[PDB]
Symmetry: C3
Subunit: 88 residues, 3 copies
């Protein structure tokens, strides 16, 4: 079936839910005022996530896997980009 | 195989492990005194979870997926009910 | 495909990413100075993780599933061992 991963921060809270569906990962967002579709959209059959909130900054790492390849996607306040993670 | 999701809170800690097995999700609980079966029992082939502890209250969100449909289940101190999450 | 689970702690942060690939789970680690392969290596087709940081101690629980059997693996500062978790 589709596969999801979820993270949250703060006391509102903010929630992010990533869904791998038919080889694509998309993102749904809650910040206390309704669910909406987030900027994250990348290929993947499987997804995991972790996040850490430091001061006023949320940092999110999304691990997107297709076949035997995992790509780390990083949110550090300014859009999503690929991170240095490799599986080795 | 079966698929799991896990969350924890506090310093004991409390742990909740959700297992999607044969289309059903069940919950195992640790609060420092042995594992036991929790109240959560809902359909699903895939599960993710996030939680946040505010004051004396734990809030848990379990995302249960079957086919292309994801249902959010909410614990806010008074049993499990479906939440407003949709995948859109 | 391969399946992952991720956790993080502190402000560096430390990150651990577990990958179930071809029936084996391995671990990649970030502590602020490059990714490296961690000590965790156990059988599994599916993996989830949770962790909690208390004082100077990180506690990690990895739930590794093969077929209908889930094994909990515990890090409490001194290597990985099986924990008391059962699915019942
Ligand atoms: O709009 C909210 C948003 O910026 O929050 C941080 C990340 O979750 C982004 O993908 C998302 O678009
Ligand atoms: O700032 C990005 C980065 O350094 O963050 C920590 C890890 O997620 C790394 O893989 C990643 O490249
Ligand atoms: O009995 C413990 C319990 O109430 O803890 C909160 C939730 O995890 C519930 O499903 C569970 O039954
Ligand atoms: O109190 C329940 C609720 O508002 O909590 C925040 C989100 O999980 C929503 O989808 C959900 O309906
Ligand atoms: O070397 C870093 C390490 O000790 O960190 C704690 C656990 O993640 C271990 O598996 C790992 O080897
Ligand atoms: O110290 C190990 C242990 O007691 O930690 C809490 C739970 O993870 C238990 O299953 C596990 O045996």
């Amino acid at each position: 079936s589709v596969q999801t991963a979820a993270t949250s921060w703060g006391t509102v809270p903010s929630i992010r839910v990533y869904t791998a569906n038919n080889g694509k990962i998309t993102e749904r967002c809650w910040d206390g005022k309704g669910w909406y579709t987030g900027a994250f959209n990348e290929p993947g059959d499987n997804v995991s996530v972790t996040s850490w909130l430091v001061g006023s900054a949320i940092h999110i790492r999304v691990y997107a896997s297709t076949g035997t390849t995992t790509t780390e996607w990083c949110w550090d306040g300014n859009g999503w980009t690929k991170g240095a993670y490799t599986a080795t």
